[PDB]
């Protein structure tokens, strides 16, 4: 039943009915509070709906259930950067790189956050890391 409302929230997101999809992910969380998939999908929908701090709360709830999800820590870094918390985003992108050192997106985004924070030394190291990962 929990995965049924998740699958409902997915289909609603295929048709871009995002607010209704978030309500479906909410009902699936009401069913199974430990559905880490429903929490991660809810944070992605809330991020698209620009309910930013509500999305970061959902990303943190999913990470508490899945401690080693590199894409979850990465998407949390996206929301924290859009929220302005550059220090929190840099620590989140660092956890995503510690989990998956092959994430070229997390390395480039960490270089953007560190450059905006002022760490030109650390940002250049993260940029060279993203260039070595992605040959493009």
């Amino acid at each position: 039943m929990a995965l049924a409302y998740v699958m409902l929230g997915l289909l609603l997101s295929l048709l871009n009915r995002l607010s209704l999809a978030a309500e479906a992910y909410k009902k699936a969380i009401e069913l199974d509070p430990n559905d880490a998939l429903a929490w991660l999908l809810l944070g992605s929908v809330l991020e698209k709906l620009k309910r930013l701090d509500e999305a970061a709360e959902a990303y943190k709830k999913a990470i508490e259930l899945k401690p080693n999800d590199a894409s979850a820590w990465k998407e949390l870094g996206k929301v924290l950067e859009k929220l302005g918390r550059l220090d929190e985003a840099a620590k989140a992108y660092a956890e995503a790189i510690k989990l998956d050192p092959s994430d070229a997106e997390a390395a480039k985004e960490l270089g953007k956050v560190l450059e905006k924070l002022g760490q030109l030394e650390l940002a250049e190291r993260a940029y060279q890391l993203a260039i070595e990962l992605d040959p493009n």
Binding site: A94, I97, K98, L122, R125, Q128, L129
Partner: protein
């Protein structure tokens, strides 16, 4: 100890000017992912730094002593709780001293003669200091006549040439200012970037 060098593949050559400074940098290095921490004896009261970091061994850290020039320095290191002794030179008294105490010792070697002197003392793992000068081609030239020898370069190792060292067949690498210099945030971030960089070199 060789099982841990092959495991974490990076050592933090930690230099500082005070016990408060060395302890802060060691915590940031460990939070960054580097488990092998080498507390140099150029730090004032380096034995006090190693002993006051005994709680990190419960987390899973390996605290050792670096730049050990004298025998009298070696006791204060071992008695403080150092798990491995490191020196930039080859000393025959220190090698036999850690031999009988039961502590792993890594002497500093730069010449094939000095490596033979250290092999006759039983050392198969050597510190290549300074790797800034001899280069990775030194490690490649020693794989022929000395195939049972493993190296740990120190000095002249950055994120640019860390793949150059591991390509030559080094066991681990020791990083100094390119990892330890900076604020606790910059040190933790530098450790994560070096851990991810080495993870991309040994793939």
């Amino acid at each position: 100890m060789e099982e841990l060098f092959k495991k974490h593949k990076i050592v933090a050559v930690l230099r500082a000017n005070s016990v408060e400074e060395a302890k802060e940098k060691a915590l940031a290095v460990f939070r960054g992912g580097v488990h092998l921490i080498e507390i140099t004896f150029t730090v004032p009261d380096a034995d006090t730094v190693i002993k006051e970091l005994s709680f990190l061994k419960e987390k899973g850290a390996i605290i050792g002593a670096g730049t050990v020039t004298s025998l009298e320095q070696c006791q204060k290191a071992v008695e403080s709780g150092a798990e491995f002794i490191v020196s930039p030179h080859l000393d025959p008294e220190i090698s036999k001293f850690c031999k009988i105490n039961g502590v792993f010792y890594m002497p500093g070697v730069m010449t094939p003669t000095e490596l033979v002197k250290a092999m006759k003392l039983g050392h198969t793992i050597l510190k290549l200091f300074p790797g800034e000068v001899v280069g990775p081609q030194f490690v490649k030239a020693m794989k022929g006549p000395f195939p049972n020898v493993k190296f740990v370069p120190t000095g002249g190792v950055n994120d640019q040439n860390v793949c150059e060292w591991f390509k030559a067949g080094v066991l681990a690498v020791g990083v100094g200012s390119a990892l330890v210099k900076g604020t606790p945030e910059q040190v933790e971030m530098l450790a994560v970037l070096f851990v991810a960089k080495i993870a991309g070199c040994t793939e």
